[PDB]
Amino acid sequence: MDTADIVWVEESVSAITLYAVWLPPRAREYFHALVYFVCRNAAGEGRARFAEVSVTATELRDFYGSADVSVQAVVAAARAATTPAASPLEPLENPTLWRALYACVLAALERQTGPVALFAPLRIGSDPRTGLVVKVERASWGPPAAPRAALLVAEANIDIDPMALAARVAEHPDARLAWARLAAIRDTPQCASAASLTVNITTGTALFAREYQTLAFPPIKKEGAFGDLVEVCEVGLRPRGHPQRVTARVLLPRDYDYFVSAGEKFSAPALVALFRQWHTTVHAAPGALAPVFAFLGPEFEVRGGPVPYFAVLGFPGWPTFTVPATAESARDLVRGAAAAYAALLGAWPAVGARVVLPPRAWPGVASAAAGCLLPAVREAVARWHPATKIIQLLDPPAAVGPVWTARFCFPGLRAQLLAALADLGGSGLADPHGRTGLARLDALVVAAPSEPWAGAVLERLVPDTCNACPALRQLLGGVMAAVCLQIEETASSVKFAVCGGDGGAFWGVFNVDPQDADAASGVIEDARRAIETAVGAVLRANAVRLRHPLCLALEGVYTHAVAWSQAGVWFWNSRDNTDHLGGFPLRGPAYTTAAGVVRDTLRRVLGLTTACVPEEDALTARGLMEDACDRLILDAFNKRLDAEYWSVRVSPFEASDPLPPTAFRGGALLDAEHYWRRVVRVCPGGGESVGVPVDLYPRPLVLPPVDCAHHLREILREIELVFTGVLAGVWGEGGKFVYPFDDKMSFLFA
Amino acid sequence: LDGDTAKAYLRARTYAPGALTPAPAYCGAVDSATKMMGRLADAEKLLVPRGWPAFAPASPGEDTAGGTPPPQTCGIVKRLLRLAATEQQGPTPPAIAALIRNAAV
């Protein structure tokens, strides 16, 4: 605390990692954590610094989300994670525990030492008698060093008996196969020691190539030395949580800051085995501590996760970014990933929804935000129900045309509303240092309009936050209902009539001369301005303030609109042949063709309408729909042999056919099964029609004839669903559109 | 059927153009029913690691009765007919090449 001996330096932090977690000599309510910073100077020179924080049980229970966690359950897990030779997959038992640990440690470090940000200039003040950093401040001394990447290519062949995988999958009927592989490796870690590995690390000024026939034996092919990538540093600290001096051995990257791995074939076990080998051969000489060996990802959960990532919580000390390949925007993807890592302190996406606020602090903020509001909006919030209808005054199939149809949207209104109400409820935050987390959210809201990565982060973050606290969902629903009420009230006086929408995005019909195009473009802008101003005023009414000013965007002007369901709608402009189709399922490559066929057929059918002809027009339309179905089925015959074209996507939340045993012999192909599963259907014999997981077998595939009749019937059901609605809406018919698949073209695939 | 669809249907639903053409020798697989089952099982074992569904048969005197009793009377012709009518998905040899053991059929 004495400033007469603090040494102040001007540096920048590239990575913050968890090094050790221990229990002070006499404590049963709090523990201590030692964290490790990889710092750099203004010209590029790695340095290693250490910080020590204390975490109480209350913060741990808050970040966990429930009161069934203890200090012992954290200390024991952290101690067991220090030895990867026996337990290399400790977070696989309880990922939530390690997420809470990381989030709470990061919050405590941000609160005690000071405000810390990555890739930013900082004033670091340390105590030379202790060796730890005691203060972090934000200053300005020039342009920091530009982050550097290093390409990584790791391939491993871990041999696991398929019987174990089958047993684990039978234990959990909807378990992703990547998690099964990871659990099988966890049960018998020796499989990682006897695996064959190839490593290729390409930095800017060197190269590191290694080929291990067996990881426990010397390499059979070598290029470069370990001393060119990383430098081993031994630092002696004297923390206040220990009675004696403690030394620590760390790896310091040289001429790079993070690894970038292309995502065409990414295998977590390969990197896990490589890092375990590095940990074993580095931390072998006695006389030093051992860093925790923990990782996180979407394969550490039974049902997986939609966003692929690989978070390094401990050893070695620098992150690894997995980026999809074969995209010409790979540079932009890497830049966006790095920006998201820097902005959100590296906790996202590992922690999840705990980057903004702990899950046990949301109810108070929501209660305060709902309390302040306004009495009518409070009544609406108290009465909100998810399956409600307020203003969408159209119905099952109905058509409008020729009129002036317009679609409006509020880009990212849920995230802005959440960030606005969090600051309203911030007065109910018991901890005054939690606001910084909300501050992070605010930054994203500012960066959403111009940075697509911020938009994606918000789109994946807001639903998770709502899932964490249902009261937040109810509050957002109530405020959105009030916004929609104001939208309807204001639109009732600008020659507008809302026909559908939820409040964030909507569509309606104007009242102007259909023929005049020089007078239709002058009313739409006026209505846009009026709606924008009214929504802004109504939001300002309830003390709800927004950072980014509101900007209602017009998505297009059309002339005909057809609705066949609550989520499907087709807009068409009969002057430039543009159209927009919504509500059509797309679960495979065979549905895009159906969507295009539907769009073209609808264009032709609604173009015939301008002939002013009676019911005969409906018969002509039915003829064209049947012709379109015939042509679609005929063109689907030339792709009867393609297995990827007919495969459909299945999420872990839907029932699916059981996995054939041979699918457990894929090997390294089972690692890339985070979320989805592509299933095709074949006919082995007489009317069997079994299912096949396409992506679990090596190419090329040798399969029986594909069951094209089943998939074509599934597609034709959706085709008829929209054609029947269009027919019943445009002409007011009552006859369902049915295509005789069985009696016309079923012989082709028989 | 008009266009390329007619050609595709004619090629995919009739014998190969060179199937019924005189040749100096025969290049098929001919054997009795039991040996034919043995060769069929070997070919199926060769083909499963790439996606072909397993047969999973049932025979009298087994430890599980289950359904589909019929013994080796009609379960040999059906599999042979299904294997013979399966075409080739490009330059790769067809499935029957795993039983005839010739990458030119």
Side-chain angles (χ1 to χ4, degrees), chain A residues 697-711:
Chain A
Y697 297 104
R699 271 76 174 97
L701 299 169
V702 183
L703 304 159
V706 193
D707 201 6
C708 289
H710 165 91
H711 294 105

PDB file of all heavy atoms in Angstrom, chain A residues 697-711:
ATOM      1  N   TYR A 697     -18.202 -41.188 -41.761  1.00  0.00           N
ATOM      2  CA  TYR A 697     -17.522 -42.213 -42.533  1.00  0.00           C
ATOM      3  C   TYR A 697     -16.499 -41.586 -43.474  1.00  0.00           C
ATOM      4  O   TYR A 697     -16.718 -40.489 -43.995  1.00  0.00           O
ATOM      5  CB  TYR A 697     -18.519 -43.040 -43.353  1.00  0.00           C
ATOM      6  CG  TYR A 697     -19.511 -43.818 -42.520  1.00  0.00           C
ATOM      7  CD1 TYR A 697     -20.825 -43.392 -42.395  1.00  0.00           C
ATOM      8  CD2 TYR A 697     -19.135 -44.981 -41.863  1.00  0.00           C
ATOM      9  CE1 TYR A 697     -21.735 -44.098 -41.638  1.00  0.00           C
ATOM     10  CE2 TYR A 697     -20.040 -45.696 -41.104  1.00  0.00           C
ATOM     11  CZ  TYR A 697     -21.339 -45.249 -40.995  1.00  0.00           C
ATOM     12  OH  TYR A 697     -22.245 -45.955 -40.240  1.00  0.00           O
ATOM     13  N   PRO A 698     -15.371 -42.256 -43.705  1.00  0.00           N
ATOM     14  CA  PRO A 698     -14.383 -41.725 -44.650  1.00  0.00           C
ATOM     15  C   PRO A 698     -14.905 -41.752 -46.077  1.00  0.00           C
ATOM     16  O   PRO A 698     -15.714 -42.605 -46.455  1.00  0.00           O
ATOM     17  CB  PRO A 698     -13.183 -42.663 -44.477  1.00  0.00           C
ATOM     18  CG  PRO A 698     -13.759 -43.921 -43.930  1.00  0.00           C
ATOM     19  CD  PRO A 698     -14.931 -43.518 -43.087  1.00  0.00           C
ATOM     20  N   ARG A 699     -14.427 -40.795 -46.877  1.00  0.00           N
ATOM     21  CA  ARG A 699     -14.846 -40.700 -48.267  1.00  0.00           C
ATOM     22  C   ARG A 699     -13.964 -41.574 -49.154  1.00  0.00           C
ATOM     23  O   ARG A 699     -12.789 -41.796 -48.844  1.00  0.00           O
ATOM     24  CB  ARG A 699     -14.777 -39.251 -48.744  1.00  0.00           C
ATOM     25  CG  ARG A 699     -16.055 -38.463 -48.511  1.00  0.00           C
ATOM     26  CD  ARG A 699     -16.186 -38.071 -47.050  1.00  0.00           C
ATOM     27  NE  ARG A 699     -17.330 -37.204 -46.806  1.00  0.00           N
ATOM     28  CZ  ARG A 699     -18.508 -37.624 -46.368  1.00  0.00           C
ATOM     29  NH1 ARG A 699     -18.739 -38.904 -46.126  1.00  0.00           N
ATOM     30  NH2 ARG A 699     -19.479 -36.738 -46.162  1.00  0.00           N
ATOM     31  N   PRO A 700     -14.496 -42.089 -50.271  1.00  0.00           N
ATOM     32  CA  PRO A 700     -15.868 -41.949 -50.778  1.00  0.00           C
ATOM     33  C   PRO A 700     -16.844 -42.906 -50.103  1.00  0.00           C
ATOM     34  O   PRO A 700     -16.438 -43.901 -49.509  1.00  0.00           O
ATOM     35  CB  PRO A 700     -15.701 -42.254 -52.268  1.00  0.00           C
ATOM     36  CG  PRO A 700     -14.621 -43.298 -52.291  1.00  0.00           C
ATOM     37  CD  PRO A 700     -13.676 -42.927 -51.167  1.00  0.00           C
ATOM     38  N   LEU A 701     -18.141 -42.628 -50.182  1.00  0.00           N
ATOM     39  CA  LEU A 701     -19.154 -43.473 -49.568  1.00  0.00           C
ATOM     40  C   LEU A 701     -19.651 -44.519 -50.556  1.00  0.00           C
ATOM     41  O   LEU A 701     -19.837 -44.235 -51.742  1.00  0.00           O
ATOM     42  CB  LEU A 701     -20.331 -42.633 -49.071  1.00  0.00           C
ATOM     43  CG  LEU A 701     -20.044 -41.576 -48.006  1.00  0.00           C
ATOM     44  CD1 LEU A 701     -21.244 -40.663 -47.830  1.00  0.00           C
ATOM     45  CD2 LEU A 701     -19.678 -42.237 -46.692  1.00  0.00           C
ATOM     46  N   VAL A 702     -19.865 -45.732 -50.056  1.00  0.00           N
ATOM     47  CA  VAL A 702     -20.466 -46.818 -50.820  1.00  0.00           C
ATOM     48  C   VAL A 702     -21.756 -47.182 -50.100  1.00  0.00           C
ATOM     49  O   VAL A 702     -21.738 -47.913 -49.103  1.00  0.00           O
ATOM     50  CB  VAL A 702     -19.536 -48.028 -50.950  1.00  0.00           C
ATOM     51  CG1 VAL A 702     -20.182 -49.098 -51.813  1.00  0.00           C
ATOM     52  CG2 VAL A 702     -18.197 -47.607 -51.532  1.00  0.00           C
ATOM     53  N   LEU A 703     -22.876 -46.681 -50.599  1.00  0.00           N
ATOM     54  CA  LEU A 703     -24.170 -46.804 -49.947  1.00  0.00           C
ATOM     55  C   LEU A 703     -25.183 -47.404 -50.907  1.00  0.00           C
ATOM     56  O   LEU A 703     -25.025 -47.314 -52.129  1.00  0.00           O
ATOM     57  CB  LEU A 703     -24.671 -45.434 -49.463  1.00  0.00           C
ATOM     58  CG  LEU A 703     -23.773 -44.639 -48.517  1.00  0.00           C
ATOM     59  CD1 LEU A 703     -24.140 -43.166 -48.556  1.00  0.00           C
ATOM     60  CD2 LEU A 703     -23.880 -45.178 -47.106  1.00  0.00           C
ATOM     61  N   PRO A 704     -26.236 -48.026 -50.384  1.00  0.00           N
ATOM     62  CA  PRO A 704     -27.352 -48.451 -51.234  1.00  0.00           C
ATOM     63  C   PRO A 704     -28.053 -47.245 -51.833  1.00  0.00           C
ATOM     64  O   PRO A 704     -27.735 -46.101 -51.476  1.00  0.00           O
ATOM     65  CB  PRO A 704     -28.269 -49.212 -50.260  1.00  0.00           C
ATOM     66  CG  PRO A 704     -27.407 -49.555 -49.097  1.00  0.00           C
ATOM     67  CD  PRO A 704     -26.417 -48.447 -48.985  1.00  0.00           C
ATOM     68  N   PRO A 705     -28.995 -47.450 -52.755  1.00  0.00           N
ATOM     69  CA  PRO A 705     -29.694 -46.303 -53.350  1.00  0.00           C
ATOM     70  C   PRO A 705     -30.363 -45.438 -52.292  1.00  0.00           C
ATOM     71  O   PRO A 705     -30.946 -45.937 -51.327  1.00  0.00           O
ATOM     72  CB  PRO A 705     -30.724 -46.958 -54.274  1.00  0.00           C
ATOM     73  CG  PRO A 705     -30.103 -48.249 -54.653  1.00  0.00           C
ATOM     74  CD  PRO A 705     -29.321 -48.708 -53.453  1.00  0.00           C
ATOM     75  N   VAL A 706     -30.265 -44.121 -52.484  1.00  0.00           N
ATOM     76  CA  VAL A 706     -30.810 -43.173 -51.522  1.00  0.00           C
ATOM     77  C   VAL A 706     -32.331 -43.216 -51.559  1.00  0.00           C
ATOM     78  O   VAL A 706     -32.942 -43.411 -52.619  1.00  0.00           O
ATOM     79  CB  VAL A 706     -30.284 -41.757 -51.815  1.00  0.00           C
ATOM     80  CG1 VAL A 706     -30.583 -40.823 -50.654  1.00  0.00           C
ATOM     81  CG2 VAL A 706     -28.792 -41.796 -52.098  1.00  0.00           C
ATOM     82  N   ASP A 707     -32.952 -43.037 -50.393  1.00  0.00           N
ATOM     83  CA  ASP A 707     -34.409 -43.016 -50.279  1.00  0.00           C
ATOM     84  C   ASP A 707     -34.901 -41.622 -50.657  1.00  0.00           C
ATOM     85  O   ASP A 707     -35.280 -40.805 -49.813  1.00  0.00           O
ATOM     86  CB  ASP A 707     -34.846 -43.404 -48.873  1.00  0.00           C
ATOM     87  CG  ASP A 707     -36.276 -43.898 -48.824  1.00  0.00           C
ATOM     88  OD1 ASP A 707     -36.888 -44.055 -49.900  1.00  0.00           O
ATOM     89  OD2 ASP A 707     -36.788 -44.131 -47.709  1.00  0.00           O
ATOM     90  N   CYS A 708     -34.888 -41.349 -51.963  1.00  0.00           N
ATOM     91  CA  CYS A 708     -35.299 -40.040 -52.452  1.00  0.00           C
ATOM     92  C   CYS A 708     -36.795 -39.805 -52.306  1.00  0.00           C
ATOM     93  O   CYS A 708     -37.218 -38.650 -52.215  1.00  0.00           O
ATOM     94  CB  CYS A 708     -34.888 -39.872 -53.915  1.00  0.00           C
ATOM     95  SG  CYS A 708     -33.114 -39.680 -54.179  1.00  0.00           S
ATOM     96  N   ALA A 709     -37.603 -40.868 -52.283  1.00  0.00           N
ATOM     97  CA  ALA A 709     -39.046 -40.697 -52.147  1.00  0.00           C
ATOM     98  C   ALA A 709     -39.407 -40.080 -50.802  1.00  0.00           C
ATOM     99  O   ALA A 709     -40.255 -39.184 -50.729  1.00  0.00           O
ATOM    100  CB  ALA A 709     -39.753 -42.040 -52.329  1.00  0.00           C
ATOM    101  N   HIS A 710     -38.767 -40.543 -49.726  1.00  0.00           N
ATOM    102  CA  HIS A 710     -39.059 -40.019 -48.395  1.00  0.00           C
ATOM    103  C   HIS A 710     -38.710 -38.537 -48.295  1.00  0.00           C
ATOM    104  O   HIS A 710     -39.532 -37.717 -47.862  1.00  0.00           O
ATOM    105  CB  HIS A 710     -38.296 -40.838 -47.352  1.00  0.00           C
ATOM    106  CG  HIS A 710     -38.217 -40.193 -46.003  1.00  0.00           C
ATOM    107  ND1 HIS A 710     -39.152 -40.416 -45.016  1.00  0.00           N
ATOM    108  CD2 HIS A 710     -37.303 -39.348 -45.470  1.00  0.00           C
ATOM    109  CE1 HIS A 710     -38.825 -39.728 -43.937  1.00  0.00           C
ATOM    110  NE2 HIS A 710     -37.706 -39.071 -44.187  1.00  0.00           N
ATOM    111  N   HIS A 711     -37.493 -38.175 -48.708  1.00  0.00           N
ATOM    112  CA  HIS A 711     -37.066 -36.783 -48.637  1.00  0.00           C
ATOM    113  C   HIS A 711     -37.915 -35.900 -49.544  1.00  0.00           C
ATOM    114  O   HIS A 711     -38.256 -34.767 -49.183  1.00  0.00           O
ATOM    115  CB  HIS A 711     -35.589 -36.675 -49.013  1.00  0.00           C
ATOM    116  CG  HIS A 711     -34.670 -37.341 -48.037  1.00  0.00           C
ATOM    117  ND1 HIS A 711     -34.058 -38.549 -48.297  1.00  0.00           N
ATOM    118  CD2 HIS A 711     -34.257 -36.970 -46.802  1.00  0.00           C
ATOM    119  CE1 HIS A 711     -33.309 -38.891 -47.264  1.00  0.00           C
ATOM    120  NE2 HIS A 711     -33.413 -37.950 -46.344  1.00  0.00           N
TER     121      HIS A 711
END
